[PDB]
């Protein structure tokens, strides 16, 4: 539940898929939002 302000450090990091341990999303909304974001990053 430490996704208070450090969402940028996961968000722009998973654009590149750097295999870096950043944060494990414990919320379903965050996981669906990452499934949108990284799938947009793949075609980007």
């Amino acid at each position: 539940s430490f996704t208070i302000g450090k969402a940028i450090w996961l968000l722009w990091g998973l654009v590149f898929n750097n295999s870096v341990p950043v944060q494990n999303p414990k919320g379903t909304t965050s996981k669906i939002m990452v499934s949108v974001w990284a799938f947009f990053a793949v075609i980007f």
């Binding site: 499934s35 799938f39 793949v42």
Partner: protein
């Protein structure tokens, strides 16, 4: 939430103990 665990693994494989064998072959399919 073992079904939810399988869903949250399977939707994260293509997007980034024989069930693990099916998962690694499906990761090959994903790549």
């Amino acid at each position: 939430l073992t079904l939810s665990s399988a869903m949250w693994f399977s939707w994260g494989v293509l997007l980034n103990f024989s069930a693990r064998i099916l998962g690694m072959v499906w990761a090959g399919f994903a790549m």
